[PDB]
């Protein structure tokens, strides 16, 4: 029902970044609020996080060359 990217992408990435900023900058509340915002978005509209990832990759691929 929900997006796959929530556990495969969002969780580990945001974990890494959370630890990255917690032991440097110090403030990680808004970061966690963003990670949770993915969840709230998913609850409001199942699959939208996957669509976000798809749109991201589509955009970066459209404007990448060699």
């Amino acid at each position: 029902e929900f997006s796959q990217c929530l556990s495969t992408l969002v969780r580990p990435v945001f974990g890494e970044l959370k630890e990255k900023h917690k032991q440097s900058g110090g403030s990680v509340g808004a970061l966690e609020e963003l990670e949770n915002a993915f969840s709230l978005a998913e609850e409001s509209c199942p699959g939208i996080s996957d669509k976000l990832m798809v749109h991201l990759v589509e955009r970066v691929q459209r404007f990448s060359h060699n």
Binding site: A30, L31, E33, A41, C45, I48, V57, V60, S64, H65
Partner: protein, 190 residues
């Protein structure tokens, strides 16, 4: 709306805009949370993007791709005022950004690169004339900053024609684009 980092407005903002049709509320939530988190920890968005692409095994040169993506309008920095001068400001800003974004596709061929550089100069002076014309404070400071970044970009071109490092040109062009966006946002919020 506030001035944010380039990865946010050039990569994520269009994604949020496209998610509008699927669900407006969720898109707005994600957008706001991204802005806030980026404000709390500058460079967050770029890292999120990079790690995502890394995990999906999508290999790109991010600065170059960023340069290409920065061509697109930033809706929140677009002046909504109907008067000809402001719309002309939007137009000239857009033109400069669009021509600067052509650099990666052209830099390997010397001829087309020189033509591109000519067009860039033209766009810069057009935007300059428009900016100085609109002046009817912080605006002047942003204008001076813009000129400074133009000059810096030129110096970068010289250095490139010396050593041949494209990445420096890409970075400088990104800086100039960001300063253009800053000009528009400053004009919009005063």
């Amino acid at each position: 709306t506030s001035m944010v980092s380039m990865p946010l407005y050039a990569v994520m903002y269009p994604v949020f805009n496209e998610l509008e049709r699927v669900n407006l509320s969720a898109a707005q939530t994600l957008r706001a949370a991204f802005i806030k988190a980026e404000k709390e920890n500058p460079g967050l968005t770029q890292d999120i993007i990079m790690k995502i692409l890394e995990k999906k095994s999508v290999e790109v040169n991010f600065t170059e791709s960023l340069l290409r993506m920065a061509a697109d309008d930033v809706e929140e920095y677009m002046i909504e005022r109907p008067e000809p001068e402001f719309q002309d400001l939007n137009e000239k800003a857009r033109a400069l950004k669009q021509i600067l974004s052509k650099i990666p596709d052209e830099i390997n061929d010397r001829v087309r690169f020189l033509q591109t550089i000519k067009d860039i100069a033209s766009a810069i002076k057009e935007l300059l004339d428009t900016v100085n014309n609109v002046f009817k404070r912080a605006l002047e400071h942003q204008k001076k900053e813009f000129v400074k970044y133009s000059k810096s970009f030129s110096d970068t071109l010289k250095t490139y024609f010396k050593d041949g490092k494209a990445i420096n040109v890409f970075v400088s062009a990104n800086r100039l684009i960001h300063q253009t966006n800053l000009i528009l946002q400053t004009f919009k919020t005063v």
